[PDB]
Amino acid sequence: IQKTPQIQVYSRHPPENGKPNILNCYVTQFHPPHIEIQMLKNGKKIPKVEMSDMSFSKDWSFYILAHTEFTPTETDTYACRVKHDSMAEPKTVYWDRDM
Amino acid sequence: GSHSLRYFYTALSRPAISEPWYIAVGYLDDTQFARFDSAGETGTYKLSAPWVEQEGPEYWARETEIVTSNAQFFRENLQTMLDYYNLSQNGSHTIQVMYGCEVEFFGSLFRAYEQHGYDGQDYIALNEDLKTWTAADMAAEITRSKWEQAGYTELRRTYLEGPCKDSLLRYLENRKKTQECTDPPKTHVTHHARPEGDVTLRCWALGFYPAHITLTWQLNGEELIQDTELVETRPAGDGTFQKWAAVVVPSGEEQKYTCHVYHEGLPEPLTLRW
Amino acid sequence: KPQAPELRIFPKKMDAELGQKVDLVCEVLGSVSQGCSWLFQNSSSKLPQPTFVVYMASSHNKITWDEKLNSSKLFSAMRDTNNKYVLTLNKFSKENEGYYFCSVISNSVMYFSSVVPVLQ
Amino acid sequence: APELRIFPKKMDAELGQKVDLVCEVLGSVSQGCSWLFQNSSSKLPQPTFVVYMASSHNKITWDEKLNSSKLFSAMRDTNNKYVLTLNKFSKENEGYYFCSVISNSVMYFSSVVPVLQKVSSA
Ligand SMILES: *[C@@H]1O[C@H](CO)[C@@H](O)[C@H](O)[C@H]1NC(C)=O
Ligand SMILES: *[C@@H]1O[C@H](CO)[C@@H](O)[C@H](O)[C@H]1NC(C)=O
Ligand SMILES: *[C@@H]1O[C@H](CO)[C@@H](O)[C@H](O)[C@H]1NC(C)=O
Ligand SMILES: *[C@@H]1O[C@H](CO)[C@@H](O)[C@H](O)[C@H]1NC(C)=O
Numbered sequence: 001i002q003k004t005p006q007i008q009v010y011s012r013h014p015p016e017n018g019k020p021n022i023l024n025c026y027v028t029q030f031h032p033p034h035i036e037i038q039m040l041k042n043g044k045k046i047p048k049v050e051m052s053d054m055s056f057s058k059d060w061s062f063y064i065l066a067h068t069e070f071t072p073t074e075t076d077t078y079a080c081r082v083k084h085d086s087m088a089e090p091k092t093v094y095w096d097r098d099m
Numbered sequence: 100g101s102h103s104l105r106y107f108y109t110a111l112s113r114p115a116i117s118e119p120w121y122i123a124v125g126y127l128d129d130t131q132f133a134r135f136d137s138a139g140e141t142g143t144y145k146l147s148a149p150w151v152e153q154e155g156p157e158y159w160a161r162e163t164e165i166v167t168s169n170a171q172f173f174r175e176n177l178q179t180m181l182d183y184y185n186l187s188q189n190g191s192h193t194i195q196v197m198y199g200c201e202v203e204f205f206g207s208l209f210r211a212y213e214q215h216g217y218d219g220q221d222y223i224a225l226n227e228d229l230k231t232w233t234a235a236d237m238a239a240e241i242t243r244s245k246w247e248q249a250g251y252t253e254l255r256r257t258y259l260e261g262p263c264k265d266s267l268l269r270y271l272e273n274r275k276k277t278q279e280c281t282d283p284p285k286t287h288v289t290h291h292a293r294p295e296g297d298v299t300l301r302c303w304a305l306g307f308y309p310a311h312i313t314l315t316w317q318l319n320g321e322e323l324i325q326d327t328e329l330v331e332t333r334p335a336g337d338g339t340f341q342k343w344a345a346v347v348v349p350s351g352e353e354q355k356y357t358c359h360v361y362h363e364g365l366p367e368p369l370t371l372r373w
Numbered sequence: 374k375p376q377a378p379e380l381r382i383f384p385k386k387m388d389a390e391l392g393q394k395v396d397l398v399c400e401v402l403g404s405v406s407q408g409c410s411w412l413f414q415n416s417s418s419k420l421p422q423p424t425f426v427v428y429m430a431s432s433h434n435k436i437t438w439d440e441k442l443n444s445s446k447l448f449s450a451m452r453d454t455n456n457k458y459v460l461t462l463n464k465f466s467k468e469n470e471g472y473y474f475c476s477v478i479s480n481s482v483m484y485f486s487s488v489v490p491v492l493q
Numbered sequence: 494a495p496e497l498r499i500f501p502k503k504m505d506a507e508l509g510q511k512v513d514l515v516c517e518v519l520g521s522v523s524q525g526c527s528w529l530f531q532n533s534s535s536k537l538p539q540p541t542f543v544v545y546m547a548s549s550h551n552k553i554t555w556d557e558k559l560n561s562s563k564l565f566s567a568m569r570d571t572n573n574k575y576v577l578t579l580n581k582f583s584k585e586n587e588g589y590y591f592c593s594v595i596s597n598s599v600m601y602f603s604s605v606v607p608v609l610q611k612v613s614s615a
Contacts, residue, residue: 001218006376012335014287014305026333029376031219032193033109052334053124053134055107058402059379060195060216062109067336098291098301099330099343101454201454210454297550313407313431318523321597322430324408325524326547328480331376332404342404349550361432368432375557410600414538420607421531421538421589425600437598440494472538476600481545481554483527483593488537 003061004086005030007093009079015072015097023070023095025080028063036083037066040092042076072097100363101208102128104267105199106166110174113191121170127270129310130338133159135166142167150273169196173215176242180217183238192218198225198255200263211259229256281364282308282339288358288371293347300373301345302358306335313361314344378406378479380486387491389465399475399486401456406477406484407431409458411450416471416492426473429458462491495520495596497603505611506582513578516592516603524548524595526575528567530588533609541588546575584610 006029012022025039033054039046052065070078081092103126110121121142123135132148141164146152154162173196181188198213214224221235223242230252234240246252284307291299302314310332316323328345335341348356353373360369379402389395399409411426425439427450436450447469451459462469474488496519504512516526525547531538543561545554546569555562564586569575579586589605 003219006331008330008333010333010341012337022336024334024336028331033111053131054109054122055124056109056195060219065334065336098289295551315407315432321523323524324598325478325481325527325545325595328374329405329407347547347550347552412600420605422605423540423591423602425602428598428600430598439599474539482556483529483540483542483545485540488539490537
């Protein structure tokens, strides 16, 4: 009846220490469609994050893209935490420049 | 070569609250051109592509009330399923519908479809002949009877082979105007020290369009299909997509591996070495 | 890799008379796998034993047939619309009667569709 | 074309016992070996993936659907002999096992080894 969210956290363009960029949080494979997606800065929930219109795949599981602005720093932790009924606990995935 | 026009409806049935009840999104291939939703007496719309404005406010106003009327119909058929399995009506449920058509200028192939899913599971789908339906459970067999009796199947076939197809070829002509044919991928390969020894060679493809693409790793001409890690193709956020393929290689043997990128916006497959 | 591709095969069953054409469709959902292989288990085998029929690349037109079937005319392979792969039994025989299923690989793990009985 | 040889030829297992399956890959192959099996008490013989062991480097990938890493141990030596040991035979592991290698896009299979429950008592 319900599937659990798969999450990818990455940047629009090849990351470059100090240089400005965009952080994406792509949440897929979930059901029901009711979800909560938060983009964070050093553990501090980032503000006004834009979202795309929700759609779904052939297996009926939904997908959404939350995205904001950020500037890659070796001393800066960025992550995406999502809350969905299918999981025992919220799930956080950190941005990792290698992926 | 093959282009599609598809509508993705998500309606929510919750007799216990307000109603941001339905959203419907339309795509031309992998690009959304519009979003309709119930916000408005008969919904409202919001375009997202240049080659769509050419239609005019009158057109999009009519297109919106049609989508809304479809959404109401889609949602109402849920009832057949609730009565059969005798579920409560105040309970919450989800209704999803995807329909559309595609053309393959090459061999001018045409295909269409319409599939309904209730609570995240298959319910009923239109067959390739556009004249019969495949039912997923017993309740859907009731729905199938009702729709043939009502003439719903022919209405859809007429819409699919008529305006859906007409709209796809038009919207397509339109796009050729502003946006270019396709969008080739920019490629390059990174590496990564593997904590367990050896290295991971990662082949990236970014900013491509459409979303379909194939990224492969080879060694002495063989596709390393079972030592290749692929991530799900994902949106760059600017209407473009990205993907990467990784392979773990034994230390010192990097230069032996090559990455192959296949994409329609490339007259020929791209080959990249470490 | 938690996220697994999903395989859907059609039809779910087939009762074929000798001579008839039979198309088996393998629809692969997701984008975490590339290409598709068709496997066969002879009904003419009381003990299970899979046999590679063919591999269709997701690339462009690149088809690799099992060495014996390399020059056989009982089978034809065609990559159709989207991630739909078609294995066609040109002439239904006792020679290709049995159990069919597709398989794709994703991040080193082999995934398999339902097996479909193509019996007389 | 590589050749996959498997041993033993069959296994009549007593509940709770350990059982080793070995696959020797003969030929030139760049990819690793996969262990699969079709359960015996099931009509439609759909294979179940157990594990894959890379050949040119050290990396093992387990089925995470059933979490097979919890019931099996898997190893390989530098001479292309891959070992899979069922640590404690249970009805749920009963089946026809086989190994697989892919070389130049062709999937090759070893013979099928029945690992069936043997009755212990006279
Ligand atoms: C298999 O058959 C094709 C066409 O019949 C032939 O061109 C090819 O050389 C044969 N061997 C291969 C490449 O599998
Ligand atoms: C089993 O299938 C093979 C193809 O893999 C076919 O050549 C063979 O004739 C079949 N076995 C028989 C003869 O029943
Ligand atoms: C095979 O594995 C077990 C034993 O029958 C069962 O859980 C499963 O449904 C069976 N069928 C398959 C191949 O999934
Ligand atoms: C596999 O095992 C892990 C760790 O023991 C567990 O967290 C996970 O839920 C299991 N996956 C299943 C049962 O599919």
